[PDB]
Each structure stands twice: as C-alpha cells, then as structure tokens.
Amino acid sequence: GRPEWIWLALGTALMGLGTLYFLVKGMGVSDPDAKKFYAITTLVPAIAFTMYLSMLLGYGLTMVPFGGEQNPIYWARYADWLFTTPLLLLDLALLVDADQGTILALVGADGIMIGTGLVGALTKVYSYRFVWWAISTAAMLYILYVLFFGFTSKAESMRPEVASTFKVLRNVTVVLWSAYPVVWLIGSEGAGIVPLNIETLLFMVLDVSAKVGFGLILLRSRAIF
Template sequence: MQAAGELGVEGEGVWLALGTVLMLLGMVYFIAQGWGVQDPRQKEFYIITILIPGIAAASYLSMFFGFGLTEVPLTNGRVVDVYWARYADWLFTTPLLLLDIGLLAGASNRDIGALVGLDAFMIVTGLAATLMKVPIARYAFWTISTIAMLFLLYFLFVVFSEAASDLDEDSKSTFNVLRNLILVTWALYPIVWLVGTEGVAAVGLFTETLLFMVLDVTAKVGFGFILLRSRAIVGEESAPTPSSEEAAAD
C-alpha cells in the first residue's frame, strides 16, 4: 500500500504520469487548433474545451506527487487509499463538459444549470461515499450518487436531445456522438468504483487507477477532439450561408 504523500513513481504512479502527459498533450493540441480563431462562438467552445484537460492534468500531476491522496481506515479493519483530488477534478471538469454539449445542443440556460447542479450533487455524494469509514454508509452514498447519475444521463438523453433536434445535420451528428460518449463513459465510473479498492476491492489500486485514467482521457480529450474537429464547430466560418448559396445560384 502506498502511503499518503509518497511519490507515486511505481505502481499506479505510472498511470498517473501517463494521464498527466495525455491531458497536457490534449490541452496543447486544442490550444494550437484554436490559435487565431476569431468567431466568438468558436472561441467559447475552445476556451471551455481547453480548460477541461488543463484542470485534469493539474489533478493527475498532483496525484502523481502524492498530493490529493489520503487513507481512510474502515471500521472493518481495511485501510483504503483514496485519491480525493480525482473528485476535485470531476467537480470542475464534468460541468464544463455538460456546458460544452449543452451549448452545442442549443439547450436553455435553465436546463444546463439544472444538469450542472445535478452533476455537482452526484460528485459530492460520490466523494462522501469514498470518505465514509462505515462500509454500509459507503454503499449508501454510492447508491445515491449512482441514482443521481442515472437521472443526469436520462435528462441529457431526453432534454438535450430534444433541444438538438432543430440543429443542422452536422451539428446533430456531432451532438449524438458526444452524447453517446458521455452516456457510455460516465456509466462506467460507478462500476469501476464498485469493483475497485473503494468498493469491494475485486481489483487492486494499480488496475483501478488504470481504468479511471482511460475513462478520464476518453471522456475529456476524446470528447474535445471530436467536438473541435467537427464541421459543427470548425466549419461555421467557412460554411456558406443560405443567402450566399442563393447568390451563387443566381
């Protein structure tokens, strides 16, 4: 077991270092892609999307150096290593992801705000599940957090999809891909928690950290890559307007 505050250069530290590098590469790539963008709406997407892997990179780097790691002694005698910095990361990055897809869908500020509030509740109750010392309390808060996640994903699928129904084909296609990416990756997080060291400990900290890293990179860098390379975003300035098409036809 790695002691809290110990430099994670072995074991799970490999995955924390890799996660840091991949998040930084994603952030730098998004900055390079957005360099010189003038359109205000495009700038908004780039700023939000750049912040997501940037925050995650800081979180992964802090975990690699042992900050954001604590030990939780359970009442059954087991001691659990908990990376609470991961939850701090999610508390900032997941609302930004929802803001990105909400803006793409054209959802109302009220609906985006409701989903962000539900998301914050999901993360906070998930953190509570992780820090509880009584096993039954851990699973109780895990259940509450998972139920909140199911409501969130349902809201995303129904309400945001309805808002996106009026989009052009490129934007609608991008929205559908990103929505499905969120649905799949986010649904896997509570499963990894449950089978990992914070749950039933079916897998060790090494494997758990690997799984969370893969999910984080996919849900953040993968999300941004799809969004910022889509014609729904990068093609707006160059795409012809109906009036210009009519003029060309004339």
C-alpha cells in the first residue's frame, strides 16, 4: 500500500541480521575494554531494528499538516537516532580515549541535533521547519569538528592501528552524517522534491552503512583490544 514499505522491510532485516552477527562475534570476548565496544555496537542495530519495524507496521508514522497538505513523517527515525547516534559517538570516544568533558559535550551536542530535528520534523509552520534544520545542522557541524580536528589530533598520539581505524571510521562518519540533512531538506520533511520511497531508500542505505557498516570496520580491527 505504501511503496516505501519494501525499503522499511529490507532495512528491518538488515538491522536484524546486523544485531545477530554482532551478537555472535561478541560471545566469548572477555577483555573488559572489548566488551565495551561489542555492547555499544550490538545495541545500535538492535535499537535501529525496533524502530525500522515500527515504521514497517505503521506505528512510527504520523501525518503533520504543513504547506496546506498532510505530510507523512516517519518520527520513529528520531527515536532511533536519539539513542543510536550518541552510542556511535561513544564508540569513537573510546577508541581515542577521550576526556569525559569532551564526551559530554558531544552527547549533549548530539541531543540538541536530534532534538531540534524532531521539533522541526513536527513543526506545522513550514518556514520554522528550516530554522530548526539550521540549528540542528549547527549542532552537527560542532560534532564533526570535534571528531575531525579534536579526535584526529588525539588519535595521532595513540597506537598506529587505533589511529588507522579511527581515520577510517571518522571519514565514514563525516560523509554519511553530512548526507542526512540533505535528504531531509529534499524529502518529505522539507520541500518534497524527492518521493518518499526514494527518501526511504536513501535513509536505509545511510542507516545501514553508518551502523552495520560502521560496526564491521570497528569490530574487525584489533584496536578494540
């Protein structure tokens, strides 16, 4: 009935298989530091899995009146990201052994980003929706600057395999995360230039790469030990 459901179903399966794979790999791991990475990384697709399912079944979908129409908004996305994007940042902060002050600034900045993004996704006045997008984006740029400049300087002083892995995860995070505000701006949450089935596909490729793909690079490395 909804042409995007195939992508919602496919995303649900990949988040599901992702969790299963990490669950397997994580069994037997005794190193306390490594447990921390496996716990975080497995929980991310597990959370994503339940939100993709709530979108597949219609629970995570709501109509917001703006622009004189009734626009569909998959609000479960934001429930997902609210909990998953901090965890993905905590994965990086552990890799470079970041200060608590830095981690707090990141988590808080990430909360603002997803928080204001949700407010924008739900704002009924069209113009204001973009005020919130700008604020959310400004939060995002702060994170990308901490990751790109702050954490890269800290990883340079650590073991080569850590720095090598961080540099890869960093580049993936920068490119992937920077795409989300663009999709929002052209998809249903913004100007509707892109149909919802394509928007759903794009977010699904992004969510998989940033989660499952992110986790495969980190857990395949010897840096977590």
